[PDB]
Amino acid sequence: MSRMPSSFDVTERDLDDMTFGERIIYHCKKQPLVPIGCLLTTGAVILAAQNVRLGNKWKAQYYFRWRVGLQAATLVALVAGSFIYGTSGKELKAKEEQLKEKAKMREKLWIQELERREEETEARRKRAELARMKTLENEEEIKNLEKELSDLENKLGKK
Amino acid sequence: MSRMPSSFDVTERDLDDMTFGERIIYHCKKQPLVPIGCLLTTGAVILAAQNVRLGNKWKAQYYFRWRVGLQAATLVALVAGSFIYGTSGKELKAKEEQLKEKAKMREKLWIQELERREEETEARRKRAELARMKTLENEEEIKNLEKELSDLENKLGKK
């Protein structure tokens, strides 16, 4: 035991970072790329599906989140085709609210279920070593890639 | 008072919430109005400023937090001059980047919150009653304000 998942700051910003990846897409619309654009769009969710495949494969009993996992999964396919359509831009803000209400509803600050004791005894070992914030690190990793867009101006040598 | 649970949750994203106020500025950047801009900027900064003013009124303890506080007040004012200047674009990005790095640098394993006997007993009552988060709840108000700005675009004749 040297270094394992120990960065547990009870922070509910997982979905916050995920939703942020959709807002940045607006900038991509301004200057869409073919070779890099495809790798950016495809590679964006490529890492999110890996984290969901690891967290799902490793379960203690049942995963109720799977239900909503598909509901939102299909939403990305409908919003992808609705983007080109151009129904309503304001709808984005209205749809965002719906998700906001789900976050508060799901979050229970009154009652919490905690029966599995053995499961806690397993994850405590990793939390007893040390962590370097993997999620946060990835957030900075994508920020660096965005800098290339602004740096491109100097790269070409026009402005 | 000892028997007065006011809630003192030590959140890691406490300052981050205030930092979000800079991100919303981009929305106003698109054709900023004088009348609405005054109440929008001043009306938003006053919320966070009030929190600092409250501590300034009644403190009589520690003089380090006040030192960094002054630096922040001058920083937010300095960026204003850069906005109207429009000389260095990447500079603005680096300015905010340094702030993020500072937070991570400050966070250390050696230096931690020294819990005293009085603090321990106070925490018990604080949690026993309830832990309210006005800073986070008030942050939600900005979402509604931003939505109004989006409507202005439609009024002009875009969507």
From Swiss-Prot, chains A, B:
Sections of the chain in a coiled coil: 88-159
Major subcellular site: mitochondrion
Keywords: Coiled coil, Membrane, Mitochondrion, Transmembrane, Transmembrane helix
Any single Gene Ontology cellular-component annotation: mitochondrial membrane
Positions of the HIG1 domain: 5-96
Membrane topology: Multi-pass membrane protein
Transmembrane residue ranges: 32-52, 68-88
BP GO terms, sorted: mitochondrial respirasome assembly
Gene3D superfamilies, per the entry: 6.10.140.1320
Subcellular localization, as worded in the UniProt entry: Mitochondrion membrane
Superkingdom classification of source: Eukaryota
Protein family according to the UniProt entry: Belongs to the RCF1 family.
Chain's role: Cytochrome c oxidase subunit required for growth under hypoxic conditions. Involved in the assembly of the Complex III-Complex IV supercomplex, as well as in the recruitment of COX13 and RCF2 into cytochrome c oxidase. May also be required for late-stage assembly of the COX12 and COX13 subunits and for cytochrome c oxidase activity.
Name used for this protein in its record: Respiratory supercomplex factor 1, mitochondrial
Organism: Saccharomyces cerevisiae (strain RM11-1a) (Baker's yeast)
